[PDB]
């Protein structure tokens, strides 16, 4: 409608119409808002829009319209600046400078338009990046001169310098060439003397808070790069550590500055600097105690209350204390007079560590780790911290975390282990007394008994065995009495679970005490019949956990037992597992397999194996008699469930037994592969009778589960198999015949990606021994899988991922299979690799680039023969340009390192004459021409057509540097990154590629 008038550039811009459009976007809603958003996006994306920018900054009254005008200018300055005439560059600089001075003069504008001023400064800083100091030598002297007059201008100049420092030192790595980064860094460094002198004066004279805070904001940025002398050889530490900690506006920023001061590069052999480092900490801690809160203050409650900036401040104090003490605590440890300072700083940390905030606790926990590690190893240091360490034990224990929160739990366990070593008596007491307050009921809750159990379990192995024995006994007795005390099966279950959690954590105790171990296990079996939520899983999870640790005690004959306990478990296995769900039964069988692997007498292992597998083998034998006698019985979904569960039981036992599972695999193998075929036929029959929809039905998904678990069982055995002659001679031929054709000849939606996964493992372990088999795998899976996945990057995601894993391992182990491909199929192989390059999916991209690299190595390895020479003529420049395409398109940045490596390998081949033919065809270049000269020619041309805004000089220099540097990978990478910056702008300096 009327709003689209601003997109007509043939007339003057109606500024009132712009402000309609802009207001409608920011303060409007719905359909109106969306339409205005598209109009502003098209206005801004107009390549001529910057010309109408000075008009908007003068005549518009709407600050959002002006902000957008600066974004249009910003776009021009970063990307097309060097293309402008020199009068336009001076003109644009002048009205950006003019506007900034004008807005600082007007106090009302300066107070109320901070966002528009800050954007103007950032736009000014983009000009400095282009023009300073070579075309603006006087910027800094003239910045300092304007600062003396107006306080508002002085404050704004600190904002400009802060942004400059950020853009040159903190954010230059990605956005500039190395040469330009260095130039701007040297230029800031070269005139920093004058800049600091101004900052220090402002800090000492110190009138306006907003000026002081902005100056401290800028100082924070300087501390990232400036040399230590400016901090230690002036009086600025006294100001930061005393003056600016007292007032709360400056306190926040000053504390962050002192944190960064604690990270400066400092000479380590100088007493005066050591005293100064002690002093600013002393001053800082003194101001906290007198201006903010004393050592005794409840910081948990303060943080929880969340007043004003209290949470941010407490976070920053934690950061300050931890940072400084990690570096400097040794300075406070030998002097008697610094002892109180040392312990108070640590007492603040104890209080900060009680705060209920996960991420803060992690910050402080990293420091406690650093400390207690040092007290464990550093001589004569633990006696200092005895009282801090005692409090820390309560803190860690009360905040213990479920082992499920992986990272947090490890960090906590490690610290609590170190603290248990440092004082074992104190650790025991705290745990026992915390446990007493569960029995008396003062600290009692489900969460509280859980946390203490996790804590008690974390320190297993740290005590002497004799102490551990008394400790464990006391804890289990108390927990047993706690369970008897409680009423209602909700309560009893929580404690029983924690009882069993703790015993699981102490395998050394279980190993030494057989009677007790047996009782625990028989008790877990009683719990496998409890229906109450969670109990059966806990019983099974505990069983396999105890077994992984205590294997050997189940497999030998214990004194005063008639048999090894594994035999007693197997006998009652039906009765023991009768109430468990299928997946719980499988954990149980897997547990038994761990034990059976300990028996190293072969006759006895195999005897236990077939005893363990007795129930599923008898279920199996009957189902094979039923389903082969008539395929009708397999239509029943109850029979499908039972079959899948027999196979999963085998997968579970094979998982823990690996190579030992072979005799069991042999019992079922041939009938199992016949089952694969019968099932395959039903799946194809349903899909023909119902359509593609069939593959979603519970019936067909049940049948596919059988195929997948069968493939999983064979993959699992082959992955761990020690006898590879049997794998080839006995397993492989039947497997390939059962699976390959079925996969090939089903419609895409009925193909199992697990076929590909299974074949990957087969090629991995025995590919070297079955060249004809690997060929057969490719014929059956390659072209049909490629056609499923070469239309988009989304469909058949599992097949996509397994496909490139299969090709990867084929290319490593049995490369000769690709040589046997007809040239047209070899071309699809190259197409497929390059197709992988263009994926965003990391599983595919990484394998794509790896296959490319290993293929090049494989071809190099062949030496000077026809196949290698016909490969380079056909595919070398395909690989060079396809690798270049994904380096430079901005959509595959995640693959940069592997792209660079492949590109380097491709360039080195030509630079070392490892390609023994003309890469050019007849009549395209002179006859004596080396591949090196033709590589430079082709690349120049390629890049010229792909990036036509680059000069011939830019491209020639980039390639000249790139080929010189094709041995040094990190430098090569730098040159590529320089090129990725230059392609985003016009007029990049070709000399930048001489950076060294």
């Amino acid at each position: 409608g009327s709003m689209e008038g601003i997109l007509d550039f043939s007339n003057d811009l109606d500024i009132a119409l712009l402000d309609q459009v802009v207001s409608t976007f920011y303060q409007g809603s719905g359909v109106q808002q969306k339409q205005a958003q598209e109009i502003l996006t098209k206005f801004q994306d107009n390549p001529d829009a910057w010309q109408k920018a000075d008009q908007i900054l003068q005549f518009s009254t709407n600050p959002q319209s002006k902000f957008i005008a600066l974004s249009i200018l910003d776009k021009l300055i970063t990307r097309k600046w060097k293309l402008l005439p020199n009068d336009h560059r001076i003109g644009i600089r002048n009205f950006v400078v003019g506007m900034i001075i004008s807005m600082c003069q007007d106090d009302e504008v300066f107070k109320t338009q901070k966002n528009l001023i800050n954007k103007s400064d950032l736009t000014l800083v983009q000009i400095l990046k282009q023009e300073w100091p070579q075309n603006w030598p006087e910027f800094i002297p003239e910045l300092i001169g304007s600062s003396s007059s107006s306080v508002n201008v002085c404050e704004n100049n600190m904002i400009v310098l802060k942004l400059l420092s950020e853009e040159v030192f903190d954010f230059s790595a990605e956005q500039m060439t190395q040469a330009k980064a260095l130039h701007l860094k040297n230029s800031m460094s070269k005139e920093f003397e004058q800049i600091f002198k101004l900052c220090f004066q402002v800090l000492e004279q110190g009138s306006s808070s907003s000026l002081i805070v902005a100056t401290l904001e800028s100082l924070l940025r300087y501390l990232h790069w400036i040399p230590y002398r400016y901090i230690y050889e002036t009086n600025i530490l006294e100001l930061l550590s005393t003056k600016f900690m007292t007032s709360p506006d400056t306190r926040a920023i000053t504390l962050k500055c002192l944190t960064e001061v604690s990270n400066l590069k400092i000479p380590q052999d100088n007493d005066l600097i050591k005293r100064q480092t002690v002093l600013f900490f002393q001053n800082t801690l003194q101001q906290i105690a007198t201006s903010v809160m004393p050592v005794t203050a409840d910081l948990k409650a303060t943080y929880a209350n969340a007043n004003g900036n209290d949470q941010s401040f407490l976070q920053d104090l934690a950061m300050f204390l931890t940072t400084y003490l990690a570096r400097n605590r040794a300075l406070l440890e030998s002097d008697e007079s610094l002892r109180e300072l040392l312990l108070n700083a640590h007492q603040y940390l104890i209080q900060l560590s009680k705060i209920e905030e996960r991420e803060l606790f992690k910050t402080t926990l990293d420091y406690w780790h650093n400390l207690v590690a040092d007290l464990f190893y550093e001589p004569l240091k633990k006696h200092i911290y005895e009282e801090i360490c005692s409090q820390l034990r309560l803190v860690i224990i009360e905040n213990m975390v479920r082992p499920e929160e992986i990272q947090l739990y490890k960090s906590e366990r490690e610290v609590l282990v170190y603290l248990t070593h440092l004082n074992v008596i104190d650790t025991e007491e705290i745990m026992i007394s915390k446990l007493a307050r569960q029995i008396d009921g003062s600290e009692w809750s489900w969460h509280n008994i859980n946390t203490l159990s996790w804590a008690i379990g974390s320190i297993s192995g740290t005590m002497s065995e004799d102490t551990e024995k008394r400790f464990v006994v006391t804890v289990i007795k108390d927990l047993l009495g706690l369970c008897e005390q409680k009423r209602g099966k909700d309560n009893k279950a929580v404690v029983a679970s924690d009882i069993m959690y703790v015993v699981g954590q102490y395998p050394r105790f279980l190993k030494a005490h057989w009677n007790f171990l047996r009782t625990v296990i028989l008790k877990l079996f009683e719990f496998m019949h409890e229906t109450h939520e969670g109990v059966q899983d806990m019983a099974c999870d505990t069983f396999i956990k105890i077994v992984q640790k205590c294997k050997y005690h189940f497999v030998i004959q214990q004194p005063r037992e008639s048999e090894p306990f594994i035999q007693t478990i197997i006998r009652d296995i039906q009765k023991t597992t009768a109430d468990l769900q299928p997946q719980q039964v499988h954990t149980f069988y897997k547990a038994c397999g761990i034990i059976i692997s300990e028996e190293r007498s072969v006759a006895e292992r195999n005897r236990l194996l077939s005893d363990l597998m007795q129930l599923p083998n008898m279920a199996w034998d009957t189902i094979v008699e039923q389903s082969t006698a008539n395929p009708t019985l397999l239509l029943d979904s109850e029979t499908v469930k039972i079959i899948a569960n027999i196979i999963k039981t085998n997968v579970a036992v094979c998982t823990s037994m690996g190579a030992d599972f072979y005799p069991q695999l042999g019992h079922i193998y041939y009938n199992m592969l016949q089952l694969y075929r019968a099932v395959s036929s039903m799946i194809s029959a349903q899909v023909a009778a119902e359509g593609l929809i069939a593959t979603k039905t519970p019936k067909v998904r049940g049948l596919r589960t059988i195929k997948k678990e069968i493939l999983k069982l064979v993959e699992t055995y082959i992955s761990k198999a020690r006898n590879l002659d049997d794998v080839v001679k006995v397993l492989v031929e039947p497997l390939l015949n059962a699976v390959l054709e079925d996969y090939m000849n089903n419609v895409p939606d009925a193909r199992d990606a697990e076929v590909l996964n299974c074949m990957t493992t087969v090629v991995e372990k025995v590919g070297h021994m079955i060249p004809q088999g690997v060929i057969l795998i490719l014929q059956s899976v390659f072209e049909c899988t490629l056609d499923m996945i070469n239309k988009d990057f989304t469909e058949y995601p599992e097949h996509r991922v397994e496909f490139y894993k299969l090709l990867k391992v084929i290319n490593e182990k049995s490369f000769a299979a690709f040589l046997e491909l007809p040239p047209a199929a070899f071309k699809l192989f190259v197409d497929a690799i390059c197709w992988a390059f263009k994926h965003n999916n990391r599983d595919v991209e990484v394998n794509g680039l790896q296959i490319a690299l290993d293929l090049v190595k494989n071809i190099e390895r062949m030496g000077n023969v026809p196949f290698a020479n016909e490969f380079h003529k056909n595919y070398f420049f395909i690989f060079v340009s396809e690798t270049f395409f994904v380096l430079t398109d901005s959509d595959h940045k995640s693959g940069f390192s592997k792209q660079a490596l492949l590109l380097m390998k491709l360039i080195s081949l030509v630079y070392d004459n490892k390609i023994s033919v003309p890469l050019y065809q007849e009549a395209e270049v002179p006859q004596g021409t080396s591949n090196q000269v033709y590589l430079s020619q082709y690349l120049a041309n390629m890049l010229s057509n792909a990036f036509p805004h680059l000069t011939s000089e830019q491209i020639a220099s980039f390639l000249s540097a790139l080929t010189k540097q094709c041995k040094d990978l990190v430098v090569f990478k730098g040159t590529l990154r320089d090129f990725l910056v230059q392609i985003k702008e016009v007029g990049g300096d070709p000399t930048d590629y001489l950076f060294a």
Partner: peptide
């Protein structure tokens, strides 16, 4: 040993029911 046996017997009577 002595204390461990006392503990083992108490373990055997652990229950979820009253």
């Amino acid at each position: 040993d002595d204390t461990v046996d006392e503990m083992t017997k108490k373990f055997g009577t652990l229950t979820i029911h009253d």
